[PDB]
Amino acid sequence: QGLVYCAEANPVSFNPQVTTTGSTIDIIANQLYDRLISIDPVTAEFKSELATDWKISKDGKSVTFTLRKGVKFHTTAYFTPTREFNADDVIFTFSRLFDVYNPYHFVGDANYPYFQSVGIDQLIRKIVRVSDHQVRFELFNAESSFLANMATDFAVVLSKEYAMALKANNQENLFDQYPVGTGPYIYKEYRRDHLVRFYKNADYWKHEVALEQLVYDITPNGTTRIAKILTKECDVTAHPSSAQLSILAQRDDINVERETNLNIGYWAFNTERPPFDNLKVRQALVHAIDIEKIMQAVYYGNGLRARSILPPTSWAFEPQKNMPIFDPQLAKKLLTEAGYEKGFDMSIWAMPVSRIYNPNARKMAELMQSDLRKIGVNVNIVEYEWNTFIQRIGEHRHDSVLLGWAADTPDPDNFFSPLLSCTATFSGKNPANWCNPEFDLLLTKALDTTDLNLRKQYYDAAQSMIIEQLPLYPIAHGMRFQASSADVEGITLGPFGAISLANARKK
């Protein structure tokens, strides 16, 4: 038997290294690949994946991974391995991110958005082959988030042999399109904007894989995904429309999981674009927004109002005393002092698809447009296809944007570096377009130490800084939902990271 998953977007690649977009990661990361290590969703301890063991040196500058033996790369229509997984695959995979001499470093777009945002090339000096099944990472400095970064869905292990065979024929451009991994499923077919089809990996190292066939039905329209699960054309539906949760709840043969999750939905200002570079304007705009109306009409009472950019479940969470409160009069008063008592036009870019942190950006934008009109700010709503949308926000084309972040790890840095740091801005991320070295300094110091208390102190000051300067306005944290036919079991919906179907089964 097989399983049909209704995906909300086309995958932008079959290599997790080149995107941070959940829509893509959900499809490819846990299905085709494995990592060196993962993070236990309950205890937050690192768990063995392709690494059986790891040790950090005294000074935190060397990390040694012992590797699993007997691990096979996929046999696909286009590739048949000659050897089992080893240290060379690790050294190739990760050096491709930071080493300009790696022959794939510049392949495709030459962009690795997560890794560049956390400044990977200022972190890894080199990777040493101590033996066939052991490698040592040498770092320029200790970073307390390093293992957490090696546990992200982006840190998959690629095939050096495949990479090299394609290079010998000048077909490096196929590497990221026709993937080879060690994961539970294998690439069979992809039809742009229609479907992707994976097959069971009969050689999977970790366990026997239950499903023979995995199909992703690319279906951007939220109501259509509801429709498809109701008619049983799909067995699993990504990100169900909150307006249709009640309908799904009433169907006996449909299960809907609802889980707490580390995420933030926010309204980011393009801080390099006047007038949004003016702090008074940013303050004015936020006080104009009826957030409680939003908690009700958008999140349907299922979200938690944001008290900080960090979700209350983050270990560094600290509620901010000066969170802006809804006050149109105060909003009007600031707008004037900012020099805009006749207001101005502005765009609010809205996502076309439901996300954990914002189930309906369009509706939220419309509510905001209505609120803002009341103080003379004329909003036009901008919206594009999901992947196009992410790309243009990455180019900072917008005045302001409704976006957010679903955390890939429970390490608080995962909210800060990829979101608000200088390097993030220079790597096509950071919707606020905010480069503040004094803020970046706090994040560096939080990483110079492993001491939780010391880290939290810096994250406390980082949190306060975001509220004072308002590069973005934290709005809410959402629940993670997923709908599936009652015939489906073994699906993992955790508090961070992408979906996995590795243990999925029917009946």
363 labeled binding residue: no
Same domain, 217 and 81: no
| Experimental technique of record | X-ray
The parent domain of residue 395 ranges over 260-478
Q: Find residue 129's DSSP bridge partners.
A: 135
- DSSP E strands, 385-438: 400-406
Name the strand (E) or helix (H) holding 255. Answer: strand 254-259
CA proximity to 226, closest of 209, 206, 243:
243
Distance in Å from the first CA to the final CA of the chain: 9
Same domain, 167 and 202: no
How far is 98 from 123, CA to CA, in rounded Å?
9
How far is 428 from 264, CA to CA, in rounded Å?
19
20 labeled binding residue: yes
What contacts 374, CB < 8 A, 6 or more positions away?
Answer: 288, 328
Q: What are phi and psi of 326, to 5 degrees?
A: -65, 120
The CATH number assigned to the domain holding 69 equals: 3.90.76.10
How far is 40 from 444, CA to CA, in rounded Å?
25
Q: Burial letters for 139-166: b for 16+ Cβ neighbours within 10 Å, e otherwise?
A: beebbbbbbbbbbbbbbbbbbbbbbebb
DSSP per-residue codes, 338-358: TT-TT-EEEEEEE-SS-BTTB
CA proximity to 236, closest of 469, 4, 413:
4
CA proximity to 64, closest of 114, 130, 142:
130
Answer yes or no: are the C-beta atoms of 186 and 81 closer than 8 Å.
no
Residue ending a domain, among 123, 151, 180, is 180
What is the total count of domains within the chain?
3
How far is 368 from 372, CA to CA, in rounded Å?
6
Is 2 in a helix, a strand, or coil?
A: strand
Joined tokens for residue 225: 């995904």
Same domain, 347 and 425: yes
Which pairing describes strands 213-218 and 2-7: parallel, antiparallel, or unpaired?
A: parallel
162 labeled binding residue: no
Same domain, 389 and 354: yes
CA proximity to 420, closest of 268, 249, 263, 288:
268
Answer yes or no: are the C-beta atoms of 371 and 288 closer than 8 Å.
yes
282 labeled binding residue: no
Same domain, 326 and 368: yes
357 labeled binding residue: yes
Residue ending a domain, among 145, 161, 180, is 180
What contacts 333, CB < 8 A, 6 or more positions away?
Answer: none
Burial class (CB in 10 A: 0-12, 13-18, 19+), 413: buried
Answer yes or no: are the C-beta atoms of 52 and 64 closer than 8 Å.
no
SS3 sequence, 89-152? HHHHHHHHHHCCCCCCCCCCCCCCHHHHHCCHHHCEEEEEEEECCEEEEEECCCCCCHHHHCCC
Length of the chain: 507
